[PDB]
Amino acid sequence: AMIKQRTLKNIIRATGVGLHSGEKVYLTLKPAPVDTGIVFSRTDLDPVVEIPARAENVGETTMSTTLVKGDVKVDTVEHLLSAMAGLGIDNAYVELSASEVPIMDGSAGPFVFLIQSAGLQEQEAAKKFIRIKREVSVEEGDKRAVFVPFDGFKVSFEIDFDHPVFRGRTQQASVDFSSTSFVKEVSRARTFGFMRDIEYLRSQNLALGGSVENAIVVDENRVLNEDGLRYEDEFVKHKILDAIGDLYLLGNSLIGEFRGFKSGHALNNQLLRTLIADKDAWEVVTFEDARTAPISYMRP
């Protein structure tokens, strides 16, 4: 029982709007051969431009994670990449009719459900993991992102907002994926923004697809969303979701621990680039016997 690479069993399609562009977009997830990785494809262009979901192709990291190849872009890939990492998808072609991945409901729930509705296929090649051997850290002002050696996969995150809805123990969370489910405890965490920031982004022709149906909107004192939150600590869980997605730009699942302190898409990519460059801090490992592996996946 070796831990095998996985792809999709069937093609699956979805429609949505880009959070920032507001453009209607058709998404197609397709099976892919062994060692392809996650590859984004702009099918609206002629010729079709393919962009591997790797750290080396990350462009602008202000609002969302963008993949670039030349002057062709694919915006906001993190929630989809978070779903693929959470379900152990090694190989897949992601086709898009526009430059931005659809926001859906702001979380990874709809992608996780679409991927599992199509089903997974174990392939005939061993799953490759990146094991953290030494600590790697990056800092920028009071922000920090760290990789720590750990026999499993764990993500810790802390946010720091001086605001009435962001107090208590809900500003920090730790998820150990050996005991906790990505689907149940992290996948449904929606993206969020403060109204003054959203107003600024809309004035710069950004956040155009944003709404209460795909984002948690917080004003100076409350959550404006009528139906409320899905988790008591939904905001820090969304940051954990973002980190899993950004970390998947390594190209393989991690055996280690991530700790983020006010970290974002920019600092997360800087942590990846430093890890990749410090080759003594990591190694590639496979598991011919799943009983000796510290990470476990759900049946395909």
Alpha-carbon span 138 to 169, nearest angstrom: 25
Q: How far is the CB of 30 from ligand 3P3 (least distance, A)?
A: 24
265 is catalytic: yes
Of 28-36, 47-55, 160-168, 190-198, the segment contacting ligand 3P3 by CB under 6 A is: 190-198
Of 114-122, 169-177, 191-199, 246-254, the segment contacting Zn ion by CB under 5 A is: 191-199
Contact flag: residue 263 with Zn ion (CB under 5 A): no
- Partner from ligand 3P3, Zn ion, none binding residue 114, C-beta < 5-8 Å depending on class: none
**Closest residue to ligand 3P3 in the complex (CB):** 210
Q: Which of 242, 267, 269, 281 binds Zn ion (CB under 5 A)?
A: 242
Alpha-carbon span 221 to 30, nearest angstrom: 43
Say which residues have a Cβ less than 8 Å from residue 202's Cβ, sequence separation at least 6: 208, 210
Alpha-carbon span 98 to 241, nearest angstrom: 23
- Residue identified by tokens 């929606």 is 190
Say which residues have a Cβ less than 8 Å from residue 167's Cβ, sequence separation at least 6: none
The catalytically annotated residue of 216, 265, 269, 295 is 265
Alpha-carbon span 31 to 41, nearest angstrom: 13
Question: φ, ψ for residue 58 (rounded to 5)?
Answer: -75, 130
Element (H, E) at 146: strand 143-148
- Partner from Zn ion, ligand 3P3, none binding residue 217, C-beta < 5-8 Å depending on class: ligand 3P3
Helix (H, G, I), strand (E, B) or coil at 39: strand
Please say which residue, 53 or 201, places its beta carbon nearer to ligand 3P3.
201
Q: How far is the CB of 106 from Zn ion (least distance, A)?
A: 8
Kindly state the DSSP code that residue 86 receives in the 8-state scheme.
H
Q: How far is the CB of 262 from ligand 3P3 (least distance, A)?
A: 10
Q: Please tell me whether 20 is known to bind a ligand.
A: no
Residues marked as catalytic: 265
User: Applying CB under 6 A, which residues contact ligand 3P3?
Assistant: 63-64, 78, 191-193, 198, 201, 207, 210-212, 215, 217, 238, 242
